[PDB]
Amino acid sequence: TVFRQENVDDYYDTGEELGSGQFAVVKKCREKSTGLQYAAKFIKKRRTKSSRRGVSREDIEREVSILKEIQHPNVITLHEVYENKTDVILILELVAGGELFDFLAEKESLTEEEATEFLKQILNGVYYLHSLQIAHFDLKPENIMLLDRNVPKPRIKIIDFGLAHKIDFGNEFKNIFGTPEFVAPEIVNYEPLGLEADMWSIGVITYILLSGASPFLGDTKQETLANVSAVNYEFEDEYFSNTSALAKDFIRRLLVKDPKKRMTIQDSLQHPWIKP
Ligand SMILES: CN1CCN(c2cc(-c3ccncc3)c(Cl)nn2)CC1
């Protein structure tokens, strides 16, 4: 598939940088014809078929295909796509309230109500994706963005579909691997992957939201991965002494090694800690 090859600077003005990644940079932009603002994500293309730098065209096309299908309050949307010889440029919805990660750093930890306010939205977004057989594969606080961080109950959107895949056969067996602290055991062990991997990540996010601590974090990436595979985590009393047993129950049913025994997104929405 081919994208718009006109110079993006002919249609948009760019501003402040909103994010920087291994092969991507995000800049705030404004469309000249409407005055509306967006987030422009510049993704570096591979220069040769046998290169490790840049993103393969197959990977870029997959991300765009997935982004073009989604429209939900809790997920980012795609406005337009441009490309030149160096980059593919995604013009995405602007989410200007910052990362959930940064919001958490400001509060240290959240009350159960504050945590479930965010979690309900994350679950709603993931329910939408899973309904479409889309696995995100990179859920973490840095990939959750608030629309406005200065309101009592912030609205959030899931971003960064760079690792997302359609799961048409129940599982996929590809080169997929995200951030060590949030990946499921099946990712660590290079086993077939499905929608269940996202549910594990949600369990990790929940633990962090309630305690301010990462459940499997080791001193090195390899130690973290080994901890994940062994399901080496516990609820430290210092952090969870006043956390309800039902919150712990929710987490416990997500941080399960066997994906077939882990709660599904539908199960999580009906769990007594979440169900209103
Ligand atoms: C893991 N990080 C990668 C770099 N980040 C980001 C942030 C954004 C974004 C989207 C909408 N509004 C503002 C920013 C985008 Cl589009 N890509 N990566 C932040 C998360």
Report the domain count for the chain: 2
Residue ending a domain, choose from 89, 104, 119: 104
Shared domain check, 217 and 193: yes
CATH of the domain at 268: 1.10.510.10
Q: Which residues of 108-139 are buried (b: 16+ CB within 10 A; e: fewer)?
A: eebebebbbbbbbbbbbbbbbbbeeebbbbbb
Contacts of 61 (CB under 8 A, 6+ apart): 1
Contacts of 75 (CB under 8 A, 6+ apart): 125, 128, 129, 157, 158
Q: What is the C-alpha to C-alpha distance for residues 138 and 179, in angstroms, rounded to an integer?
A: 7
Q: Which residues pair with 99 in a beta bridge?
A: 145
Shared domain check, 149 and 55: no
Q: What is the C-alpha to C-alpha distance for residues 137 and 157, in angstroms, rounded to an integer?
A: 15
Q: What is the C-alpha to C-alpha distance for residues 213 and 80, in angstroms, rounded to an integer?
A: 38
Q: At 92, list the tokens.
A: 């995405």
Q: With a 6 A CB cut-off, is 102 part of the ligand 1 pocket?
A: no
Q: What is the DSSP string of the chain?
A: ---B-S-GGGTEEEEEEEEE-SSEEEEEEEETTT--EEEEEEEEBPSSTT-SSSB-HHHHHHHHHHHHH---TTB--EEEEEE-SSEEEEEEE--TT-BHHHHHHHHSS--HHHHHHHHHHHHHHHHHHHHTTEE----SGGGEEES-SSSSS--EEE---TT-EE-SSS-B-SS----TTT--HHHHTT--B-THHHHHHHHHHHHHHHHSS-TT--SSHHHHHHHHHHT-----HHHHTTS-HHHHHHHHTTS-SSGGGSPPHHHHHHSTTT--
Report how this structure was experimentally obtained: X-ray
The answer to whether residues 40 and 29 touch, using CB atoms and an 8 Å cutoff, is yes
Residue 20 labelled as part of a binding site: yes
Atom of ligand 1 nearest to the CA of 90: 16
In a domain, 3, yes or no: no
Atom of ligand 1 nearest to the CA of 28: 13
Q: What is the C-alpha to C-alpha distance for residues 207 and 128, in angstroms, rounded to an integer?
A: 23
Q: What is the C-alpha to C-alpha distance for residues 201 and 242, in angstroms, rounded to an integer?
A: 23
∠ CA 57-58-59, nearest 5°, is 90
Shared domain check, 223 and 92: no
The residue length of the chain stands at 276
Q: Which residues pair with 156 in a beta bridge?
A: 146
Q: Which residues pair with 26 in a beta bridge?
A: 19, 41
Contacts of 209 (CB under 8 A, 6+ apart): 104, 109, 110, 114, 115, 118, 119
Q: What is the C-alpha to C-alpha distance for residues 56 and 30, in angstroms, rounded to an integer?
A: 28
Q: What is the C-alpha to C-alpha distance for residues 66 and 27, in angstroms, rounded to an integer?
A: 21
Q: With a 6 A CB cut-off, is 78 part of the ligand 1 pocket?
A: no
If you take atom 19 of ligand 1, which residue's CA is the nearest one?
19
Q: What is the C-alpha to C-alpha distance for residues 118 and 100, in angstroms, rounded to an integer?
A: 9
Residue ending a domain, choose from 79, 104, 129: 104
Q: Is 138 a catalytic residue?
A: yes
Range of the domain at 231: 105-276
Shared domain check, 154 and 135: yes
Contacts of 127 (CB under 8 A, 6+ apart): 265, 266, 269
Q: Which residues pair with 134 in a beta bridge?
A: 166
CATH of the domain at 39: 3.30.200.20
The residue type at 101: F
The residue type at 55: V
